[PDB]
Structure 1
Amino acid sequence: QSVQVFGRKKTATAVAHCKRGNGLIKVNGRPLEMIEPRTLQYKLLEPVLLLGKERFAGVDIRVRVKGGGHVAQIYAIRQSISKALVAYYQKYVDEASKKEIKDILIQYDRTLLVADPRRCESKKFGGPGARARYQKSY
């Protein structure tokens, strides 16, 4: 049983399976704070202290994430967690608390529950990159 909420950034995508619990947060065999980078750690911690530990104390959400790159796997765990919390609150308890948390998250970061649409652009022949071109002599 999941809140069916998902969350993406770049080709990466994360979903928070949700159940009734006491706010224990886990990410693919690990909790939310033992993630390897230890410098992107603040990016993962953004929600849990952006709105407080109390709101993350009555719901158990396990965030499964599949995608490329370290940082692109981030911005998916955090957004999935925040949007899963907002959807859980919206569909189960009420909207007033849900509306409050949504306003808080949007004010801190408007792209906290909306996906980042940008994707890597294709490459065109006669150049290595999307917009870079091969050097030639005049």
Structure 2
Amino acid sequence: TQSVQTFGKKKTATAVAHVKAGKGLIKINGSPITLVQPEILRFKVYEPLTLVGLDKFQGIDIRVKVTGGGHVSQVYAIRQAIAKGLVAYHQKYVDEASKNELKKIFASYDKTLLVADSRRMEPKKFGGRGARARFQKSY
């Protein structure tokens, strides 16, 4: 059937989204999105839904598997996998006119829904406890 598989990434977290044709099943690691444990960030994954309207997800079901990163870093990876999966499905099984419409609303609200953040942790350098921080100097 009509199946597309995509992925979103944050610092280390990576969420692999599978978007198949169906009744509209949207699960996080086999669990409904209505029960994400970062409760204060539950609307971060609700943003790709309410921006376009839930009617777009009638015909597609989404199952993601998010691993790596941390609690917050996984949420941004998940919301990116969902947003990219919806676009990739439209480009392949729907006219590209609709795909360009959906891509417009997401980008006009938040770039990170479709574009992965390129920031990674700076390496630590000797002479300090951090990337730029240095040991306290004495005279």
Q: TM-score range by the shorter chain?
A: over 0.9
The Cα of 1:6 is off from its aligned counterpart by: 1.0
Q: Which has the higher helix share?
A: 2
2:40 counterpart SS class? coil
The sequence identity of aligned pairs, in percent, is 66
How do residues 1-138 of structure 1 correspond to structure 2 at under 5 angstroms?
A: 3-138=4-139
Q: 2: distance between equivalents of 1:33 and 1:101?
A: 23
C-alpha contact (below 8 Å) 2:30/2:63 kept by paired residues: no
Q: 1: distance between equivalents of 2:96 and 2:86?
A: 12
1:19 counterpart SS class? strand
Superposition RMSD in Å: 1.2
Size of the aligned set, in residue pairs, is: 138
Letter in 2 for 1:96: A
Q: 2: distance between equivalents of 1:72 and 1:110?
A: 16
Q: 1: distance between equivalents of 2:5 and 2:26?
A: 17
- TM-score, with structure 2 as normaliser: 0.94
C-alpha contact (below 8 Å) 1:28/1:64 kept by paired residues: yes
Question: Cα deviations across residues 4-42 of structure 1 (Å, max 9, x unaligned)?
Answer: 321101111111112111111011021112001210101
Q: 2: distance between equivalents of 1:59 and 1:5?
A: 14
Q: 2: distance between equivalents of 1:33 and 1:67?
A: 21
The Cα of 1:50 is off from its aligned counterpart by: 1.1
